[PDB]
Symmetry: C3
Subunit: 332 residues, 3 copies
């Protein structure tokens, strides 16, 4: 059974076919690939874009999406095996995934790490649990990676540059400020897709502490070798932006500080200058800027940068709808 | 771009055409005016009628409605310009409105005032923000005015009296009791539509403190002059009800006490007799009674008054569905 | 007007016709029995299966379901008559049921007892209130009985045994452990449907304190007399399981302790051995096991029992979808 957990699990040809079908769906939005079909959208965390695009995406293809939020409307779910369920969780994922499997044709799931222990969050328990027990394809709506975002980001870049071949472009994935430590998911996905597309990637971040988990640094290396791009870590702002064609910002908490954020606050707090402003975008080769959203103005990027015609954040967000309809159509 | 923020922004002919299309949709509920289309229903406050009628309204016209609740399922939204977003709001309306604009064909929004400062609530920031940044038509689902309610109220009166011309009817908008201070929105809308229809309007309320914001008292005066009706403020119960053809109740907090309700409790508390009962309805010319709902029995109106065949509250509520489908059809 | 509050209110022929239409819908899932129609699903408590199956059920028949949660998105509802509404409830069921009646074609409602007073919970106020004031058919989505579960349970048994005639089978409804006292609804429904089908029913429970309300024990007696089955209460585990063909587990709080659970904790706590494990299922005549779900593993039933091929819990859950589409089709 084929799922959509990570773009890394898919071949370049399949990914390419997906992006092309996404471009096609963008030209003809209404269809019947999901006629009479349905998808269960399971959200363990907030969402505006993902929830809306999937729900409309299912409607436009003749299907229906059922939105569930364990702990809110649906019963809380247990993922650990062989445990005694006398706590807060009412039912086990082994039952939930099989029950949903009898109702829907697809299951999407969103579950952010708990932030208490990266050693456990990095295992991707929820996503893997759904894929293991569900008899129908599973779609990652963001856990420790954000594959749907990757394709919406990629398509937006190919549209911008007028070509599917992004090789040669100087790509800069820069960490940015936020009063609190966030999930690395989007950052991990960005590095994965930028290198998979064969671009010259520079992971700009404050200190070595903010470097992404090895799993993704290695995925990137393997992608560079195969795609013909390059990987580079940097702690110097100006040099990174130098001649960049694309700038993707995202804030996240230093992995080494998981479960012990108190001593991390003072550190991230001394790097508020990482905010993307006009000066930094000026050093780029008339580069394009984007962010996965939700974005906090004058914190992650300035008003001017967001209002800039070089900001393709809205196009990328729109592409979530088209790229996701392509994933669903391919999974059924 | 045409929106539906207030009936005041629309001409009498357009309003008339809307009410007529609403009457038509009521005869033939299923259609295709919204086939393959969608609407984002953004709720910052509770709702039963508005949420249900819009969702069914979209379904019956071939479209789909996506229901969002910032702070609950979707991310919290910032509306102030040029502020530093390091607080509770995760993204700005400038992005949210443009993102939704790429997904849906219509955006409805409901946002009650904060009740801390009428000087700020009266600006209608949320509604104006959506209309300013959205590339698609915006619909007021109640903020400081409740335009959809107005048309559902109007149509229900025209049906009741068997004619679209309400001129000459004695209309009484009476304030009523409630343990807490409420939004003036419905009251402001009632005054606006009753005078716009050319009726003889009497705003009955406890003390001059409970008179509506000048903006609406002036809208009413302009409407009277043009529609051929009349406006009158009153603090005397029996005289107001005298020969009235229509009685519309609604409770609200005295504007002068916004942000300082403590000294208002004792005042509203000494006017519980404003409740609409059989005696007051007896003084009317066999008048009809209604309320926007949700209505608290034996507080705003008595059980007998609600069970009375003169209570057209349920018809008015039903009309929300028909009048709204007419607004959506006209906006797309 | 015909509703679906309890299977007890329906004749055997009607119930049979329902189960058969459910079997038919299972073979042909898409239809038009609810084309252009809609149903309001009112949830006062959590739900995953009921909410999902009804929503998909309505979609598959050409209709649309609007999901409401009073106190969350919709306004809180008052059910007591002639009370003064100055509390937390914003509107009365007399209005809510009539308003919904103008919007939808069907109303489903889920409302668990408050657990403070069984004398009041047993009256089934919410369900009866909806059925009394609504101009459209009402469907019990679980209050003090769970009729939709009953039919999904029944159909699953008829499929398992390859026949609609379950007479002769040894049916065991056993109470099981849970750290907290739960609703008796499912237990009451199980006893009602098992005896209505004419099986040899044994209500196995810890102490006489855990025997179900007389209303249901009497319904069972009347059903036994008519269906040709038998009823029996037991406090002995091994004897009950002896040669059973079906084992249905469910945990619930002792009725006599309603509103005073403190002294009940220690009692239920000394009966954790009621958990359904391999040993007990071994004493059965190769019996089938099921539960309504959500089920807490290694508390109500062990992992082995749930993973056992004799566990038909997932089939029963799937049947909720088919049996409910049959109820809606019959009510419209
Ligand atoms: C279908 C059963 C619904 C509900 N179940 C619960 O309340 C169990 C919840 C828990 O275990 O936390 C009940 O017992 O009536
Ligand atoms: C698409 C990004 C989702 C999420 N974002 C947040 O949690 C930011 C929320 C905030 O700024 O309050 C994240 O960082 O993974
Ligand atoms: C259609 C009216 C919506 C809202 N009503 C309330 O907030 C009343 C709620 C309550 O009585 O608790 C208002 O007054 O504007």
């Amino acid at each position: 059974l084929k799922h959509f957990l990570n773009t890394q699990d898919w071949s370049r040809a399949e990914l390419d076919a997906l992006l092309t079908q996404a471009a096609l769906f963008k030209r003809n939005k209404l269809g019947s690939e999901l006629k009479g079909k349905s998808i269960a959208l399971v959200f363990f965390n907030p969402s505006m874009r993902t929830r809306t695009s999937f729900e409309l995406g299912a409607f436009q293809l003749g299907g229906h999406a059922v939105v569930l939020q364990p702990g809110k409307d649906a019963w809380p779910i247990e993922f650990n095996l062989g445990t005694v369920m006398d706590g807060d969780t009412a039912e086990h994922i082994a039952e939930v995934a099989r029950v949903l499997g009898r109702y829907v044709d697809l299951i999407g799931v969103r579950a952010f790490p708990k932030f208490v222990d990266w050693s456990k969050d990095r295992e991707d328990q929820v996503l893997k649990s759904f894929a293991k027990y569900s008899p129908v394809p599973v779609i990652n709506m963001e856990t420790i990676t954000h594959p749907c975002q990757e394709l919406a980001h990629a398509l937006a870049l190919q549209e911008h540059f007028g070509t599917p071949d992004l090789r040669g472009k100087k790509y800069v994935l820069t960490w940015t400020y936020h009063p609190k430590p966030l999930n690395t998911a989007v950052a991990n996905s960005a590095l994965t897709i930028a290198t998979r597309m064969g671009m010259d990637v520079t992971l700009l971040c404050p200190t070595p502490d903010y470097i992404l988990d090895e799993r993704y640094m290695d995925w990137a290396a393997q992608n560079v070798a195969e795609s013909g791009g390059s990987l580079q870590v940097s702690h110097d702002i100006d040099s990174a932006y130098a001649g960049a064609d694309v700038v993707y910002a995202k804030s996240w908490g230093a992995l080494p500080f998981f479960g012990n954020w108190e001593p991390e606050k003072p550190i991230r707090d001394q790097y508020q200058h990482f905010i993307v402003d006009e000066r930094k975008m000026a050093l780029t080769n008339n580069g394009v800027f984007s962010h996965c959203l939700p974005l906090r103005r004058n914190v992650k990027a300035t008003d001017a940068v967001m209002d800039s015609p070089n900001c393709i954040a809205i196009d990328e967000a729109e592409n979530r709808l088209h790229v996701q309809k392509a994933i669903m159509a391919a999974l059924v």
